[PDB]
């Protein structure tokens, strides 16, 4: 039997301004910093330790890891930073206000864009400032593998290699692993690990900064999973995540 812990980054500046983020590299707010610190305390008090962590190349996930490593006294552990754990790419929605966007296109359309399995948001133009091609983070990724937008199904295809080739072998080797990442990239990994159907993944929302522990059998199949923390604080967290709602 093995344990794997997962954590969405703490509140970001764009979670607060209610803007679709994707691969735009925004930072944590003070509240997001505190969420991260608190997740570290919670794991330290529960006795958890880690031998290795995996995260994205986006600083909001990475600063969340930093805060967890700091409160846990694990600043020395190996960290693999991978573009494959990047938040699902939000195309030409990136930067737009989610409420103003539901007001223009329909609340339905915005639910498709945020939560469906296989519908992509509209794509960036290839010369959009926000396209990834000049970014040194992705200098080694061949150009055709880089998205201008992504549906969740693409996020799954992009995450699995890291899991098959690196994270699964770490877990089996006996390493105690933390993955600090993003709402939708974690939705995607969970969809694979739990065998959640295309239909059912629509409703899964993951709150900011709450450790989520998978217990895995020897074949890496989930036995159970649970959040750590106040179950009330977090039902409220997931209730706020439902903010694809139009404004006045």
UniProtKB/Swiss-Prot annotation:
Cross-referenced InterPro entries: His_Pase_superF_clade-1, His_PPase_superfam, PG/BPGM_mutase_AS, Phosphogly_mut1
E.C. no: 5.4.2.11
Chain residues that bind substrate: 8-15, 21-22, 60, 87-90, 98, 114-115, 183-184
Listed SMART domains: PGAM
Keywords: Gluconeogenesis, Glycolysis, Isomerase
Transmembrane segments: none
The UniProt record lists the keyword Isomerase: yes
GO MF term list: phosphoglycerate mutase activity
Gene3D superfamilies: Phosphoglycerate mutase-like
GO BP terms: gluconeogenesis; glycolytic process
CDD domains: HP_PGM_like
Assigned protein family: Belongs to the phosphoglycerate mutase family. BPG-dependent PGAM subfamily.
Subunit structure: Homodimer.
Official protein name in the record: 2,3-bisphosphoglycerate-dependent phosphoglycerate mutase
Source organism of the structure: Burkholderia pseudomallei (strain K96243)
């Amino acid at each position: 039997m093995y344990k794997l812990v997962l954590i969405r980054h703490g509140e970001s500046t764009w979670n607060k301004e209610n803007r679709f983020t994707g691969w735009v590299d925004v930072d944590l707010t003070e509240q997001g910093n505190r969420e991260a610190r608190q997740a570290g305390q919670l794991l330290k008090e529960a006795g958890y330790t880690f031998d290795i962590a995996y995260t994205s190349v986006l600083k909001r996930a990475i600063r969340t890891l930093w805060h967890v490593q700091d409160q846990m006294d694990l600043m020395y552990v190996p960290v693999v930073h991978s573009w494959r754990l990047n938040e699902r790419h939000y195309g030409a929605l990136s930067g737009l206000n989610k409420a103003e966007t539901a007001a223009k296109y329909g609340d339905e359309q915005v639910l498709v864009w945020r939560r469906s399995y296989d519908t992509p948001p509209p794509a960036l133009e290839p010369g959009d400032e926000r396209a990834p091609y000049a970014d040194p983070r992705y200098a080694k990724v061949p150009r055709e593998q880089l998205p201008l937008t992504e549906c969740l199904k693409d996020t799954v295809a992009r995450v699995l290699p890291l899991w098959n080739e690196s994270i699964a072998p770490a877990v089996k080797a006996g390493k105690q692993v933390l993955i600090a990442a993003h709402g939708n990239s974690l939705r995607a990994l969970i969809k694979y690990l739990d065998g959640i159907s295309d239909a059912d993944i629509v409703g899964l929302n993951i709150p900011n900064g709450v450790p989520l522990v998978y217990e895995l059998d020897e074949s890496l199949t989930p036995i159970r999973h649970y959040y750590l923390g106040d179950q009330e604080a977090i039902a409220k967290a997931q209730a706020a995540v439902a903010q694809q709602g139009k404004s006045a």
